[PDB]
């Protein structure tokens, strides 16, 4: 039943031992043991079926037995920019469906600018990231990029529409007239908001401003709520069966 990631691609073994965290996991604190069924996938959006076959101290050893296109990925590519707890951000944004996070530094965000401390906890976000993909099926697992400024993450251009919250705003995300190629990159800023020359770098790269309602919402609301209704109004929330 449970599903595991592999962090090599499986596309022609027949056999592997688990990563570290997936060794202990699986044969220390679920306790399996040999012959026990489980999911592996290693991101390539394919899962392969498999057996545990030895399940030792250090090391869990499984054979496996298929190879199958699994997508549970949204056709709407989602990019958060996120402004610096974010392990619950993490996990809901993947389960939602988001391609890609970069975690960011802002001139008002209230934490010294520190690459190196970001780093870090980057690793273990990756882990959450993992784990959220374990969890809700995804076979594909989201990227968290290198802590970046605001300003420099808002000059990025790949093809993808640039939104940010603001009170001005005419358009809601839904009555955004246009979505690209490249799918969306939304900016969630922190409590102290944007400083002026980030106002004007939003200008400058042609943000789409957007209204999500007349309340006033936490950080982490705020962000799962824009990326639901992203998902309902152009992604994989909104269609039928």
Known sequence: ???????????????????????????????????????????????????????????????????????????????????????????????????????????????????ERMDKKIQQWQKIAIAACEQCGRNIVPEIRPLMKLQDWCAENDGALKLNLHPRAHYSIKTLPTIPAGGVRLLIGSEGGLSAQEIAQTEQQGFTEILLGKRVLRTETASLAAISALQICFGDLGEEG
């Open 1 to 115: 039943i449970p599903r595991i990631y592999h962090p090599i691609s499986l596309e022609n073994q027949t056999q592997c031992y688990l990563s570290e965290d997936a060794a202990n996991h699986v044969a220390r604190v679920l306790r399996m043991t040999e012959g026990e069924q489980l999911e592996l996938f290693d991101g390539s959006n394919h899962i392969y079926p498999a057996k545990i076959i030895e399940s030792n101290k250090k090391s869990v050893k499984v054979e496996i037995l298929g190879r199958e296109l699994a997508d549970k990925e949204s056709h709407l590519k989602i990019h958060l920019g996120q402004v610096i707890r974010m392990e619950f951000t993490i996990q809901k944004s993947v389960e939602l469906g988001v391609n890609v996070i970069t975690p960011l530094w802002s001139e008002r965000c209230g934490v010294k600018l520190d690459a």
